[PDB]
Design a protein around this nucleic acid. Structure first.
Ligand SMILES: Nc1ncnc2c1ncn2[C@@H]1O[C@H](COP(=O)(O)CP(=O)(O)OP(=O)(O)O)[C@@H](O)[C@H]1O
Ligand SMILES: [Mg+2]
Ligand SMILES: [Zn+2]
Lengths: 49, 172, 145, 98, 43, 244, 101, 212, 239
DNA sequence: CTACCGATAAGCAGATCTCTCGATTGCGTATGA
DNA sequence: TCATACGCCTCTCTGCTTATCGGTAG
RNA sequence: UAAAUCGAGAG
């Protein structure tokens, strides 16, 4: 922010949008992957629609 | 249109004086450009014109069912004989004079009589003009339809062509 | 020598018969994978040109060069469809393109603020375009005191 | 997404269906709109116009107008147009006040 | 899905979700390189 | 003035308006048909009227039909006379065509009307005949030469162009050189003006006139040539028949 | 009257000043593009139609666009063109320095 | 068969030499233009074994390259004699990387690599360990007619380009970090490359891409 | 299907049937192709509607992401490119072209020496290094277009155009000297530059879509035996 | 031994220019007349 | 006996996404 | 003045 590479509103371009989308998709896939919540080690019911 | 798929809107009502009169005094009631023929190859119109001219000269009706003539009985010869017997040109041509300059044209003009049909696509059922008329309700844009005094549509392609010119104010 | 399939590494061993330097392939994805983005752009231009040339139609290479550069603007073999469209700052353009519902949720979940840059967004909001006569402003030199 | 239909006649489109397809709101009402001050007719040739003009029929010439503001230089022409009126070309159909 | 009803957190590790949050915060301002350089702080 | 489908830029230009008080069709010149891809066919096309000064000045300058002489697809020209003007030019520019003084002057004034601003000079200037005796006789190539010399602005040299046309030298006889179009100091001296000169043809007389004198002079030349070949086609009409 | 508007005005003018490219270092085309010419003519015609003062001799002319073209030929149009660069910086050319065709 | 294997090994060795020379380390035409006879004389045993232990080398930067990139340091090229990638065999080189204080390391394996190494390659920062394949280096990709010339830009040149075109780092055309030429050039993320395309309408013209 | 008749003497019944078959196929294909090209053109123009020429002579999308640093590498308009190679025509109408261009009034706002000097240096460099492999051609002098703005520096022309001009001036030894002709043609190159704000993406999409509506006019069916048989035309564009 | 990681097999979802006319619009049922 | 309001009353392409059978380290 | 479906057409 100090040297001018980015303002306080944040720089948003196509490639950073693509990287953010890929990261979020991978984050969701990893979230939905593994059960057995490691914060407390308890199985959870599996939902369905 | 003729009976060989030669479309075309009437362009102008050419006055009889400006119409190119022939030697006998006949001024044609319909002029068709000779350039329409080479691309469509409607030689049936060429045969029909001279066949009808011979029929009108001799007071007879000429049949035109397909596959009566062959390569040894060509209809061009068959009706050119009748034209020559009647006393006209064997090839259906006619000495013609321009109605504006009065001098004989460079070549012998091809004249004849062909059956012509008036199509139902009159210009009185196709033209629209709107300055400010009724509008929609949920979009406030002009309504659709000629009978409703509605405007015409500029689509995605028209908008693209309007910005392709670089014309932004035209688009707006 | 032409084949009926793409696998570059196989013909790399046959240097004695085949000159491995001039191996140009019809496929673009394999060329991108094994040679790089720039070779993919070159083969995209060549493939999009040889179809026109075979039909005796001339298209200047600026158009094909622009198309190839836009298609490989991320270093990947993109396309002109919604699956190669979502990477764009302006959302209104994609919503106007197609799948208006899907692109609306993807833009409202992350609070995607758009600056009205593409012509589609400016058309939606009724703003003067930025291409052509709208790529600049006009000021007046008023001689006050 | 609606569930429940035995015979029916037509399933009422949702608000999403009003903005989605080619007939939806977007592609039919902002990517392209019906326009005021525009005409349409059949074309006929005319080799006597200067290869850059259009032959405007007098029927179109009495309906399509342009909002010329009156000035010191425009006063005579616009006065004559107003006097001629909306039926005699060239003429005026409205006089928008200030 | 991918949530815990007992401890009321995600079934992912807190460290993993913290790493993802840090990466997303870096990408918010456009530090597309610092996001990848953050992965090598396993220590 | 737009026709659907608009496949490219040229299918939507901006024409000036000429109020013809006869009937109810939009009357279009013959050069625009190549770009609009229409025939006088029952074909229909819209006519939008911009309502502010910016759009007026920006359809008169950026979108006007003069600026769309060359399509951006490959740079090839898209305007030009189409069907009978080509045949009229082929017949007029052949060396078999000679015109007396009256015919020459009438043909020139039928297209170079100085009252409307067709020619820069206030006085129409002509050329000496190609045959002084027994009696004066001009030529069709002389007609083209003086047409160009009247529309071309003065204080500027003529067009020095060397081109070709589609009719081979064998069609005109033996030892003929009518396949090679030659312009020297703005005077046509060899070859006929077929489609390869005016129309959808590259490096023709109209293309060279455009590239030398701007697009407005090329448009004026196109209009003047279309008017000249129209008036020549009424005097000596072109016809086709069964004998052909 | 708060400083919560004075600060915003000051920062807006500061950002605008940092955006402007000085006359000594503008590196754009000295010629006037066709789009610039068309927009200048249209805007000048609008101003003339809205009863703005004119400087040229109105030799029996009634079209504001024609008057604008005459002024552009005489280079008496009092308008400044703010060419915009992709980042946001701008250079303030005027019609006088810009040369046509 | 051993003759063909030795030919492939020599082609891979020449490709590695050319890659290092392009990257900007002091490699002369010797050990690059090495004929097959010389390769058999030097890097072959009494029977014809490849003896990849002896073809490992350390490459030092040129003076011009040092001036261009002051932070550039020495590089090590390691050839895997083991047919697969072994954890201990790779760990020896990995620890030697900082034992000798090597800023960059090049790894060439025969067939495949364990995926614990993929988690282990970014274990000694800022030292970079780039891995390659023996079958992927048989033909130099940059020698292809279609592939243009890629030149890495220094910090000064990249800053000058960004200031001239008033760009952000992310608005340039992107080149994948897994691109075959990106691996060739060893581009870090954020390093702008220069491409000299042989355009059909302009001959030589320079285009720029950023690695991200 | 090989009919021996002609439209002047008429065609037999079987020949009539075969010709009707062929005409029906032609009309079916004509109907299909127009609808086929529309989706391609629409997708192309929807994606490329924003990219335009900026004031840096570098074309880029609406948001700002750079696509090309120069339009085609030379930034010259396709419409005005027509008579930039016609050196014979330009030499013949030198006087008319000079009257059109007026280099006298285009001096006080132009720089003439730096671009020309760099162009000569680069030309000599390439001529010295011409006989070099593509990969070994280490770049020391970039093309003059890269540094000097072609719309402000006379002589900053393309490598192709400069090579063609030099070859013409060397092969054709002609009152016009080589210096004045070179200056005139460099001014012509400067004036034949694409303007900032051009909708280059729209132009490219239209110029790629509209010629595809004239497809399948020439059939050239793969009558060869064991040939490539690559997909051709609209399907190939779709792929 | 067994969980994280992939590599198919199957299903799912979204796609495949303008303009003018004309015609048409549900059974089914159940109680207050 | 019998009419209008209420209640419903089967021959094309591209991906993405989820589930399930194989493998490696710990 | 509407809106949808089907049918017939023009370029
Ligand atoms: N599906 C469609 N989309 C767009 N335009 C269509 C169309 N179907 C028909 N047309 C129009 O029908 C007209 C036919 O013209 P074309 O066949 O292309 C020239 P032509 O073959 O030389 O006709 P000709 O034989 O009468 O001389 C075109 O103007 C075209 O715009
Ligand atoms: Mg038509
Ligand atoms: Zn939990």
């Amino acid at each position: 922010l100090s040297d001018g590479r980015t303002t306080e509103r944040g720089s948003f371009t196509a490639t950073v949008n693509d990287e953010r989308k890929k990261l979020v998709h991978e984050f969701h896939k990893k979230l939905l992957s593994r059960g057995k919540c490691d914060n407390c080690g308890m199985f959870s019911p599996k939902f369905r629609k | 249109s003729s009976r060989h798929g030669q479309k075309g809107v009437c362009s102008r009502k050419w006055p009889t004086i400006d119409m190119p009169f022939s030697e006998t005094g006949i001024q044609p009631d319909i002029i068709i450009n000779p350039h329409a023929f080479p691309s469509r190859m409607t030689i049936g119109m060429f045969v029909e014109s001279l066949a009808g001219k011979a029929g009108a000269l001799h007071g007879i009706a000429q049949d035109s069912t397909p596959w009566i003539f062959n390569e040894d009985d060509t209809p061009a010869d068959y009706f050119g004989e009748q034209l020559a017997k009647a006393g006209y040109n064997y090839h259906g041509n006619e000495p013609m004079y321009s109605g504006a300059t009065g001098e004989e044209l460079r070549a012998d003009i091809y004249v004849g009589v062909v059956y012509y049909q008036r199509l139902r696509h009159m210009v009185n059922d196709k033209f629209q003009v709107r300055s400010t008329g009724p509008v929609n309700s949920l979009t406030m844009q002009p309504v659709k339809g000629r009978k409703r005094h509605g405007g015409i549509r500029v689509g995605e392609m028209e908008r693209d062509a309007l910005i392709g010119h670089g014309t932004s104010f035209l688009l707006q | 020598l032409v084949t009926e399939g793409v696998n570059f590494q196989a013909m790399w061993d046959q240097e004695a018969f085949i000159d491995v330097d001039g191996i140009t392939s019809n496929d673009v994805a394999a060329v991108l994978k094994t040679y790089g983005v720039e070779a993919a752009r070159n083969t995209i231009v060549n493939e999009i040109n040889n179809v026109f040339s075979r039909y005796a139609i001339s298209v200047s290479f600026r158009h094909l060069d622009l198309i190839a550069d836009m298609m490989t603007r991320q270093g990947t073999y993109l396309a002109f469809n919604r699956q190669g469209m979502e990477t764009s700052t302006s959302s209104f353009m994609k919503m106007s393109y197609e799948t208006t519902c899907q692109f609306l949720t993807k833009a409202v979940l992350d609070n995607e603020r758009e600056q009205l840059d593409s012509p589609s967004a400016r058309i939606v909001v009724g703003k003067l375009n930025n291409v052509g006569t709208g790529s600049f402003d006009v000021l007046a030199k008023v001689p006050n005191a | 997404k609606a569930q429940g239909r035995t015979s029916g006649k037509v399933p009422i489109p949702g608000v999403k269906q009003a903005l989605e397809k080619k007939e939806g709101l977007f592609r039919k009402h902002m990517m392209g709109k019906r326009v005021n001050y525009a005409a349409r007719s059949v074309i006929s040739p005319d080799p006597n116009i200067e290869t850059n003009e259009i032959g405007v029929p007098p029927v179109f010439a009495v309906k399509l107008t342009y909002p010329e503001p009156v000035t010191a230089y425009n006063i005579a022409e616009l006065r004559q147009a107003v006097i001629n009126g909306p039926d005699k070309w060239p003429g005026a159909t409205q006089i928008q006040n200030e | 899905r991918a949530s815990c009803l007992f401890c009321h957190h995600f079934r992912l590790k807190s460290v993993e979700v913290h790493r993802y949050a840090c990466k997303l915060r870096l990408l918010q301002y456009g530090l597309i390189d610092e996001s990848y350089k953050l992965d090598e702080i396993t220590l | 003035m737009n026709r659907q489908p608009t496949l490219h830029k040229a299918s939507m230009m901006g024409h000036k308006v000429r109020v013809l008080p006869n009937e109810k069709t939009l009357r279009l010149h013959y050069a625009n048909t190549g770009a609009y891809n229409a025939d006088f066919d029952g074909d229909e096309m819209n006519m939008h009227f911009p309502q502010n000064e910016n759009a007026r000045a920006e359809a008169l300058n950026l979108a006007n039909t003069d600026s769309q002489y060359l399509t951006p697809t490959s740079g090839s020209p898209v305007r030009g006379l189409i069907q009978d003007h080509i045949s009229a030019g082929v017949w007029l520019t052949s060396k078999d065509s000679f015109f007396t003084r009256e015919q020459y002057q009438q043909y020139i004034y039928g297209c170079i009307r100085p009252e409307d601003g067709h020619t820069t000079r206030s006085k129409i200037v002509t050329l000496p005949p190609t045959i002084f005796k027994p009696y004066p006789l001009w030529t069709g190539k002389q007609i083209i030469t003086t047409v160009l010399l009247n529309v071309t602005p003065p204080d500027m040299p003529g067009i020095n162009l060397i081109s070709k046309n589609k009719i081979k030298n064998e069609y005109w006889g033996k030892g003929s050189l009518e396949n090679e179009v030659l312009f020297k100091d703005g005077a046509l001296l060899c070859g006929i003006l077929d489609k390869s000169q005016y129309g959808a043809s590259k490096y023709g007389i109209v293309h060279s006139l455009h590239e030398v004198y701007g697009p407005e002079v090329a448009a004026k030349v196109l209009s003047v040539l279309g008017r000249l070949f129209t008036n020549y086609i009424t005097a000596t009409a072109f016809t086709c028949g069964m004998d052909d | 009257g708060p400083e919560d508007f004075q600060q915003h005005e000051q920062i807006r003018r500061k950002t605008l000043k940092e955006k402007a490219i000085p006359k000594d270092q503008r590196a754009t085309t000295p010629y006037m593009t066709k789009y610039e010419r068309a927009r200048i003519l249209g805007t000048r015609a609008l101003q003339i139609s809205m009863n703005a003062p004119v400087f040229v001799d109105l030799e029996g002319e009634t079209d504001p666009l024609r008057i604008a073209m005459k002024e552009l030929a005489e280079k008496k149009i009092p308008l400044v063109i703010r060419r915009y660069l992709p980042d946001g910086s701008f250079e303030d050319w005027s019609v006088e320095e810009l040369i046509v065709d | 068969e051993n003759e063909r294997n030795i030919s492939r090994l020599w082609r891979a060795f020449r490709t590695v030499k050319e890659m290092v020379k392009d990257r900007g380390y002091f490699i002369t035409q010797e050990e690059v233009e090495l004929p097959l006879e010389d390769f058999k004389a030097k890097y072959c045993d009494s029977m014809g074994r490849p003896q990849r232990k002896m073809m490992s080398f350390q490459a030092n930067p040129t003076e011009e390259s040092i001036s261009k990139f002051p932070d550039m340091g020495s590089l090590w090229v390691e050839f895997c004699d083991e047919p697969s990638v072994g954890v201990k065999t790779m760990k020896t080189f990995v620890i030697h990387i900082q034992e000798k204080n090597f800023q960059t390391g090049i790894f060439v394996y025969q067939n495949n690599i364990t995926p614990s190494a993929m988690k282990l390659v970014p274990s000694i920062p800022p030292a970079t360990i780039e891995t390659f394949n023996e079958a992927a280096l048989v033909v130099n990709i940059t020698h292809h007619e279609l592939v243009p010339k890629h030149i890495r830009l220094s910090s000064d040149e990249k800053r000058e380009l960004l200031k001239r075109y008033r760009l952000k780092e992310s608005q340039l055309p992107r080149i994948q970090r897994a691109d075959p030429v990106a691996l060739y050039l060893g581009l870090k993320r954020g390093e702008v490359v220069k491409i000299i395309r042989k355009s059909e309408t302009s001959g030589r013209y320079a285009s720029y891409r950023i690695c991200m | 299907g090989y009919v021996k008749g002609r439209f002047y003497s008429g065609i037999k019944p079987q020949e009539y049937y075969f010709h009707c078959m062929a005409g029906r196929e032609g009309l079916i294909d004509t109907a299909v192709k127009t609808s086929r090209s529309g989706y391609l053109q629409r997708c192309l123009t929807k994606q490329l509607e924003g990219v335009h020429v900026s004031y840096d002579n570098s074309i880029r999308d609406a948001d700002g992401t750079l696509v090309q640093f120069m339009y085609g590498g030379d930034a010259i308009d396709i419409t005005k490119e027509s008579h930039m190679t016609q050196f014979e025509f330009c030499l013949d109408n030198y006087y008319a072209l000079l009257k059109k261009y007026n280099p006298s009034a285009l001096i006080e706002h132009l720089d003439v020496e730096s671009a020309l000097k760099y162009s000569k240096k680069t030309l000599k460099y390439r001529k010295k290094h011409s006989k070099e492999p593509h990969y070994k051609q280490s770049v020391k002098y970039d093309p003059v277009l890269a540094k000097y703005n072609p719309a402000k520096y006379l002589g900053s022309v393309s490598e192709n155009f400069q090579d063609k001009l030099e070859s013409f001036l060397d092969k054709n030894s002609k009152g016009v000297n080589e210096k004045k002709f070179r200056a005139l043609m460099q001014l012509k190159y400067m004036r034949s530059l694409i303007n900032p704000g051009e909708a280059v993406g729209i132009i490219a999409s239209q110029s790629v879509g509209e010629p595809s509506t004239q497809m399948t006019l020439n059939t050239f069916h793969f009558a060869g035996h064991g040939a490539a048989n690559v997909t051709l035309g609209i399907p190939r564009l779709r792929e």
